[PDB]
Amino acid sequence: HHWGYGKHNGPEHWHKDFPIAKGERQSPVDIDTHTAKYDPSLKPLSVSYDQATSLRILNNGHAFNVEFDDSQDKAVLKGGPLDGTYRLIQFHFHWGSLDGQGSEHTVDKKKYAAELHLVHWNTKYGDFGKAVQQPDGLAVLGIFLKVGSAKPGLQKVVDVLDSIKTKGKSADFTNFDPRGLLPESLDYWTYPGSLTTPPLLECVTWIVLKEPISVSSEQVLKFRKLNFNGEGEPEELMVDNWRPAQPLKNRQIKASFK
Numbered sequence: 511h512h513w514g515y516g517k518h519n520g521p522e523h524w525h526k527d528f529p530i531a532k533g534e535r536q537s538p539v540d541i542d543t544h545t546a547k548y549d550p551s552l553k554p555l556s557v558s559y560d561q562a563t564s565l566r567i568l569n570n571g572h573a574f575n576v577e578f579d580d581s582q583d584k585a586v587l588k589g590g591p592l593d594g595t596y597r598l599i600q601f602h603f604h605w606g607s608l609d610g611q612g613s614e615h616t617v618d619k620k621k622y623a624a625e626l627h628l629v630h631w632n633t634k635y636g637d638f639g640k641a642v643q644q645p646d647g648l649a650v651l652g653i654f655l656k657v658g659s660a661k662p663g664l665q666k667v668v669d670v671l672d673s674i675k676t677k678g679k680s681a682d683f684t685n686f687d688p689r690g691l692l693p694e695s696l697d698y699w700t701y702p703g704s705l706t707t708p709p710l711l712e713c714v715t716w717i718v719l720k721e722p723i724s725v726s727s728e729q730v731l732k733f734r735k736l737n738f739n740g741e742g743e744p745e746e747l748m749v750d751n752w753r754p755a756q757p758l759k760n761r762q763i764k765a766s767f768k
């Protein structure tokens with residue numbers, strides 16, 4: 511009876527095995543655009559992905575992860591709210607059964623069709639497992655997806671999903687350029703929060719881009735053909751793998767822009 515997104519093991523159950531689910535800095539949150547304060551002391555954001563080394567794509571039963579070589583500073587996030595250097599280790603998405611839901615963060619309670627998370631760890635803790643034990647251990651760059659025009663930089667991901675349909679399947683995924691997933695603008699919102707899946711650790715500086723990317727209905731339909739289940743188990747479509755908005759509590763969301 512491990513955690514997931516069903517009625518019997520979904521986000522309302524997680525607190526039973528992971529009590530930090532009801533903690534003070536849980537993610538995601540609703541971003542109230544009229545309450546978020548422009549902070550003129552936020553430095554520009556530095557996304558330096560030109561030397562990024564992608565290796566593998568994995569269906570982990572909750573999402574699919576595109577994994578990077580993080581054994582050196584190759585693909586890093588710096589600046590904005592961050593001190594020091596955060597190494598890209600993986601990206602993944604959360605998405606819905608229909609275009610009206612799927613994002614984890616919301617903007618004035620608006621839900622996007624999906625949300626991309628680019629996950630980075632703070633190099634001053636040496637490895638990822640050490641970083642997630644620290645309040646400033648991770649930086650996740652969150653990017654909303656809306657359904658419209660195709661994202662060309664996403665199609666190599668979409669076309670490999672048939673090969674990793676079920677939990678525990680992986681495929682070689684070299685020479686993938688994550689810069690193809692970014693919007694034009696790096697304007698963002700930032701707040702301190704958590705992992706959005708168990709173990710829900712309160713180790714994340716969230717950086718959520720204001721500008722969504724557009725993907726096509728055909729691209730997101732292929733996300734929805736993935737399976738949560740292992741091969742030769744009953745088919746459960748991988749849809750609605752998003753946690754809903756958590757209480758903001760004693761936190762302030764900061765805007766990079768006026």
Ligand SMILES: COc1cc(OC)c([C@H]2C=C(Nc3ccc(S(N)(=O)=O)cc3)C(=O)O2)cc1OC
Nearest residue numbers: 627629638639640642650704705706707708709
């Ligand atoms: C208790 O120790 C661990 C358990 C554990 O899973 C049960 C894990 C898992 C969780 C991991 N990471 C992760 C989860 C959510 C996000 S999101 N959606 O962007 O907020 C980003 C990263 C990971 O790599 O692995 C990591 C752990 O330690 C490193």
Ligand SMILES: [Zn+2]
Nearest residue numbers: 602604627706
């Ligand atoms: Zn995520």
